[PDB]
Automatic annotation (TrEMBL):
Domain Large ribosomal subunit protein uL11 N-terminal per the UniProt entry, residue ranges: 8-64
Name this protein carries in UniProt: 60S ribosomal protein L12-like protein
One Pfam family cited in the UniProt record for this chain: Ribosomal_L11
Gene Ontology CC terms: cytosolic large ribosomal subunit
GO molecular function: large ribosomal subunit rRNA binding; structural constituent of ribosome
Domain annotation Large ribosomal subunit protein uL11 C-terminal: ranges: 69-138
Family membership: Belongs to the universal ribosomal protein uL11 family.
UniProt function note: Component of the ribosome, a large ribonucleoprotein complex responsible for the synthesis of proteins in the cell. The small ribosomal subunit (SSU) binds messenger RNAs (mRNAs) and translates the encoded message by selecting cognate aminoacyl-transfer RNA (tRNA) molecules. The large subunit (LSU) contains the ribosomal catalytic site termed the peptidyl transferase center (PTC), which catalyzes the formation of peptide bonds, thereby polymerizing the amino acids delivered by tRNAs into a polypeptide chain.
Length: 155
RNA sequence: CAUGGAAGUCGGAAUCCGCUAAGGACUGUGUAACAACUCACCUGCCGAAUGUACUAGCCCUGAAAAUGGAUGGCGCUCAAGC
């Protein structure tokens, strides 16, 4: 009746995976699972979505482990950026993440599907649209103006 | 975005909606980071006022000299003062 030892852990604060070893002795000690397996699993999961931690969730399954992604709107907005983030430059201005605000971001918002009520996606789409206030949407248009000016369709 | 580590509170730069009557992509304590405690903010109780800045009357502070001492003296307090 081990029940696979359901344990949930979070891995973030990084860029483009990295395959870092250990760094989670507390996670490893719980469930008698090898930390290297979880680190390798998390690195593989984050390899697909580079330059964005996306808050990977690690689930302990007996001696094995499982990887899960959050599909966060902010993580997707981080992915929708200007090209890739080169190394040896993250200490400098990392503002080079400006992309167009269009239906691609609108569809990417549908992953949440209004988890916190939001009265369906009517307020969820506008809220996820306004989430990209750092890049100010595309050109002179702004996420604040896009969300405030209610003229587009609901979906 | 920074990252052995920063989950609001090393550090650089903006400020969204669902939920309500109601909570910040945060004031402060705090963790390596969480957390907790908050706090802002809202709500139970209560039953009539409350806050800030100014104006000018009396009184008080500012107000230290040489023999013992002078509202003329005694004394006077809802005055025997203004
Ligand atoms: K007289
Ligand atoms: Mg005399
Ligand atoms: Mg007389
Ligand atoms: Mg008189």
């Amino acid at each position: 009746d081990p029940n696979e030892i359901k344990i949930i852990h979070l891995r973030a604060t990084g860029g483009e995976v990295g395959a870092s070893s250990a760094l989670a002795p507390k996670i490893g000690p719980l469930g008698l699972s090898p930390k290297k397996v979880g680190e390798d699993i998390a690195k593989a999961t984050a390899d697909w979505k580079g330059l964005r931690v996306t808050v990977r969730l690690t689930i302990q399954n007996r001696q094995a482990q499982v990887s899960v992604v959050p599909t966060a709107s902010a993580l997707i907005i981080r992915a929708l950026k200007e090209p890739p983030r080169d190394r040896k430059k993250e200490k400098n201005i990392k503002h080079n993440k400006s992309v167009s605000l269009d239906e691609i971001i609108e569809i990417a918002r549908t992953m949440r599907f209004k988890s916190f009520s939001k009265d369906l996606k009517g307020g969820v789409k506008e809220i996820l649209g306004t989430a990209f206030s750092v890049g100010c949407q595309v050109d002179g248009k702004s996420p604040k103006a896009i969300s405030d000016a209610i003229e587009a369709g609901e979906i």
